[PDB]
Design a protein around this ligand. Structure first.
Ligand SMILES: Nc1ncnc2c1ncn2[C@@H]1O[C@H](COP(=O)(O)OP(=O)(O)O)[C@@H](O)[C@H]1O
Length: 311
């Protein structure tokens, strides 16, 4: 391997393309993967296993998707599992395959059937704490064996997955860590204390890395707005239309589009509502014709749209 190497030394850059900010989190991930490809990790255990602590809407899933895409060359190459739907006893059977003579037997269990059909992939468990403690045991086994045994007794190979578990447990106490005093590492410490209270220490050690996601800064969110309206620019390029934003215009979209409790979840449909909707209005009315560079500024009733007349 030579080109596969080149991609790994430049790995962080490849991820920052799609994931703004969260640099600490990205070293963390990228490192663990270098230790894999170098061959310093136990080869009968998955490429990497992570705990993603932190607020919602600030990059967890994105990184998950991005990683998947930059490692296995597609967003499809990742499996999302929601621990909210696994709070029951009945859960275990849906995860790996309900015992014979059961509704969802031969149709398999979606986890084991996904990994079975796609052995090199990223796997995302959301709200790992919401999981029924039975389901944990199944995960732990997998974390040590790189193997799981489904209902039909067929053994499923996880030695080529990256495992990522998100949880919001820390969050209300990384808010105190946001307030400077607790910088790079001290948060990753004071959180461990709360983690021990919810998670057994056998579990917190199969884990390759515990990663703290921080909230976003205005300038960061501003960047996300750009990446966020990439498809639209491309869409508009087909009719040769440009979209200069203003400093304030970006800030407006950022203002409306970042809920603290939800991060940038709302953003995409804010952009859609505040910028795409009125832009369609203009385009259809003819105030924007094929060719124009449209300028976009803030006002009292939201975004306002300027076109230079013809030279
Ligand atoms: N750091 C980031 N880099 C790029 N996009 C981000 C970032 N943080 C949030 N987003 C945007 O927020 C949206 C959803 O966020 P998500 O990945 O679900 O965060 P979480 O998993 O914490 O809920 C995505 O469209 C994504 O583009």
């Amino acid at each position: 391997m030579l080109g596969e190497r080149e991609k790994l030394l430049r790995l962080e850059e490849e991820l920052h393309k799609r994931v703004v900010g969260q640099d600490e989190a990205i070293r963390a991930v990228a490192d663990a993967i270098r230790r894999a490809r170098a061959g310093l990790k136990d080869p009968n255990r998955p490429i990497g296993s992570f705990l993603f602590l932190g607020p919602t809407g600030v990059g967890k899933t994105e990184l998950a998707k991005t990683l998947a895409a930059t490692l296995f060359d597609t967003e499809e190459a990742m499996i999302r599992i929601d621990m909210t739907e696994y709070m029951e006893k009945h859960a275990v059977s849906r995860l790996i395959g309900a015992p014979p003579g059961y509704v969802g037997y031969e149709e398999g269990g979606q986890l084991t059937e996904a990994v079975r059909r796609r052995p090199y992939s990223v796997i995302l468990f959301d709200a790992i704490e919401k999981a029924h403690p039975d389901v944990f045991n199944i995960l732990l086994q997998m974390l040590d064996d790189g193997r799981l045994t489904d209902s039909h007794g067929r053994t499923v190979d996880f030695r080529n997955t990256v495992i990522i578990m998100t949880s919001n447990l820390g969050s209300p106490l990384i808010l105190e860590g946001l307030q400077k005093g607790w910088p790079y590492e001290r948060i990753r410490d004071e959180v461990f204390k709360v983690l021990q209270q919810h998670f057994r220490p056998e579990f917190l050690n199969r884990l390759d890395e515990i990663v703290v996601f921080r909230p976003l800064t205005k300038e960061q969110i501003r960047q996300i707005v750009e990446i966020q309206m990439s498809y639209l620019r491309a869409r508009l390029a087909e009719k040769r239309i440009s979209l200069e934003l203003t400093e304030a215009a970006k800030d407006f979209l950022a203002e409306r589009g970042y809920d603290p409790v939800f991060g940038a979840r709302p953003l995409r449909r804010v952009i859609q509502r505040e910028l795409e909707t009125p832009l369609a209005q203009k385009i259809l009315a003819g105030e924007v014709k094929e060719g124009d560079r449209v300028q976009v500024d803030v006002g009292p009733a939201g975004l306002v749209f300027a076109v230079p007349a013809r030279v």
